[PDB]
Amino acid sequence: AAPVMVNDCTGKVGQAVAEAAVAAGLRLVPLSLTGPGRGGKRVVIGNVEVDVREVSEREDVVKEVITEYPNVIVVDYTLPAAVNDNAEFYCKQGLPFVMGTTGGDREKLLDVARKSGTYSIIAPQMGKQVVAFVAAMEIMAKQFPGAFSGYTLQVTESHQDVSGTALAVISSLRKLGLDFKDEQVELVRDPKEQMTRMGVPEQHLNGHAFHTYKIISPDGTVFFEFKHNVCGRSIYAQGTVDAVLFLSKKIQEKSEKRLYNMIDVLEGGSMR
Amino acid sequence: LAAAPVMVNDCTGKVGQAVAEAAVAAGLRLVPLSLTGPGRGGKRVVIGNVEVDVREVSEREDVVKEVITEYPNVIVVDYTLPAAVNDNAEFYCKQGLPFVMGTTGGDREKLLDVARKSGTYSIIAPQMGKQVVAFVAAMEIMAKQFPGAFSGYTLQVTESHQSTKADVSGTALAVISSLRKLGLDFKDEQVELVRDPKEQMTRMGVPEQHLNGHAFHTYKIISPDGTVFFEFKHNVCGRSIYAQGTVDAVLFLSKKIQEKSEKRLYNMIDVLEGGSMR
Ligand SMILES: NC(=O)c1ccc[n+]([C@@H]2O[C@H](COP(=O)([O-])OP(=O)(O)OC[C@H]3O[C@@H](n4cnc5c(N)ncnc54)[C@H](O)[C@@H]3O)[C@@H](O)[C@H]2O)c1
Ligand SMILES: NC(=O)c1ccc[n+]([C@@H]2O[C@H](COP(=O)([O-])OP(=O)(O)OC[C@H]3O[C@@H](n4cnc5c(N)ncnc54)[C@H](O)[C@@H]3O)[C@@H](O)[C@H]2O)c1
Ligand SMILES: [Ca+2]
Largest Cα span, chain A: 68
How far apart CA B126 and CA A19 sit, in angstroms, is 48
Number of domains in chain A: 2
Q: Looking at the structure, tell me whether residues B117 and B158 fall in a common domain.
A: no
Contact A225 B233 (CB under 8 A): yes
State how far the alpha carbon of A192 is from the alpha carbons of A122, A197, A232, in Å.
Answer: 36, 8, 18
Residue A143: Cβ within 10 Å count = 16
Q: Looking at the structure, tell me whether residues A142 and A27 fall in a common domain.
A: no
Quick check: A81 and A104 in contact, CB under 8 A?
yes
Of the candidates B220, B211, B100, the one whose C-alpha atom is nearest the C-alpha of residue B160 is B211
Q: Looking at the structure, tell me whether residues A137 and A210 fall in a common domain.
A: yes
> Which chain A residues contact residue B134 at CB under 8 A?
140, 144, 147-148, 176
Of the candidates A23, A26, A16, A44, the one whose C-alpha atom is nearest the C-alpha of residue A231 is A16
Residue B216: Cβ within 10 Å count = 22
With a 6 Å cutoff on the Cβ, whether A30 touches ligand 1 is: no
Q: Looking at the structure, tell me whether residues B265 and B166 fall in a common domain.
A: no
Non-local (6+) Cβ contacts of A258 within 8 A are A113, A114, A117, A118, A119, A120
> Which chain A residues contact residue B214 at CB under 8 A?
none
The region, left, alpha or beta by phi > 0 then psi within -120 to 50, assigned to residue A167 is alpha
Q: Looking at the structure, tell me whether residues A42 and A68 fall in a common domain.
A: yes
Contacting B residues, span 128-157, partner chain A, CB-CB under 8 Å: 129-131, 134-135, 137-139, 141-142, 145-153
Q: How many CA atoms lie within 13 A of B180 on its CB side?
A: 10
Name which of B142, B152, B273 is nearest A144 (Cβ-Cβ). Answer: B273
Contact A224 B135 (CB under 8 A): yes
Is the dihedral angle over the CA atoms A168, A172, A173, A175 positive or is it negative?
positive
Answer whether B227 touches A (CB < 8 Å). yes
DSSP state, B13?
Answer: S
Alpha-helical segments (H) within chain A? 12-24, 58-68, 83-92, 106-116, 128-143, 164-175, 191-196, 234-252, 262-267
Q: Looking at the structure, tell me whether residues A220 and A269 fall in a common domain.
A: no
Residue type, B185: D
* Resolution of the structure in the document, Å: 2.2
Answer whether B223 touches A (CB < 8 Å). yes
Atom of ligand 1 minimally distant from the CA of A55: 32
Answer whether A23 touches B (CB < 8 Å). no
Q: Looking at the structure, tell me whether residues A155 and A131 fall in a common domain.
A: yes
Non-local (6+) Cβ contacts of B128 within 8 A are B102, B241, B242, B245, B246, B249, B268
Paired residues of B44 in beta bridges: B53
Q: Strands across the sheet with B43-47, in order?
A: B33-36, B50-56, B43-47
How far apart CA A95 and CA A73 sit, in angstroms, is 7
Of the candidates B178, B164, B265, B250, the one whose C-alpha atom is nearest the C-alpha of residue B215 is B164
Contact A140 B137 (CB under 8 A): yes
How far apart CA B136 and CA B181 sit, in angstroms, is 14
Burial class (CB in 10 A: 0-12, 13-18, 19+), B167: exposed
Non-local (6+) Cβ contacts of B127 within 8 A are B133, B136, B170, B171, B268
Non-local (6+) Cβ contacts of B204 within 8 A are B158, B160, B194, B216, B218, B235
Overall size of chain A counted in residues: 272
Three-class secondary structure of residue A9 per DSSP: coil
Q: Looking at the structure, tell me whether residues A120 and A159 fall in a common domain.
A: no
Q: How far is CA B11 from the centre of its chain?
A: 15
Q: How far is CA A74 from the centre of its chain?
A: 15
Contact B231 A227 (CB under 8 A): yes
Quick check: A119 and A96 in contact, CB under 8 A?
yes
Q: Looking at the structure, tell me whether residues A106 and A50 fall in a common domain.
A: yes
Largest Cα span, chain B: 67
With a 6 Å cutoff on the Cβ, whether A35 touches ligand 1 is: yes
How far apart CA B13 and CA A149 sit, in angstroms, is 28
Three-class secondary structure of residue A188 per DSSP: coil
Estimate the crossing angle of helix A234-252 against helix A12-24, to 10 degrees: 60
Q: Looking at the structure, tell me whether residues B179 and B215 fall in a common domain.
A: yes
Non-local (6+) Cβ contacts of B172 within 8 A are B157, B159, B191, B217
Quick check: A146 and B275 in contact, CB under 8 A?
yes
How far apart CA A202 and CA A244 sit, in angstroms, is 32
How far apart CA B204 and CA B188 sit, in angstroms, is 20
Q: Looking at the structure, tell me whether residues B242 and B213 fall in a common domain.
A: no
Say whether the peptide bond before residue A8 is cis (omega within 30 degrees of 0): yes
Nearest ligand to the CA atom of A208: 1
Helix then strand count (H, E) for chain B reads 9, 12
Method: X-ray
Q: Looking at the structure, tell me whether residues B201 and B228 fall in a common domain.
A: yes
Q: How far is CA B159 from the centre of its chain?
A: 18
How far apart CA A39 and CA A179 sit, in angstroms, is 53
Quick check: B244 and A148 in contact, CB under 8 A?
no
Q: How far is CA A261 from the centre of its chain?
A: 10
How far apart CA A242 and CA A262 sit, in angstroms, is 9
Say whether the peptide bond before residue B78 is cis (omega within 30 degrees of 0): no
State how far the alpha carbon of B257 is from the alpha carbons of A223, B24, B90, in Å.
Answer: 33, 21, 19
Domain hosting residue A71, numbered range: 1-125+232-272
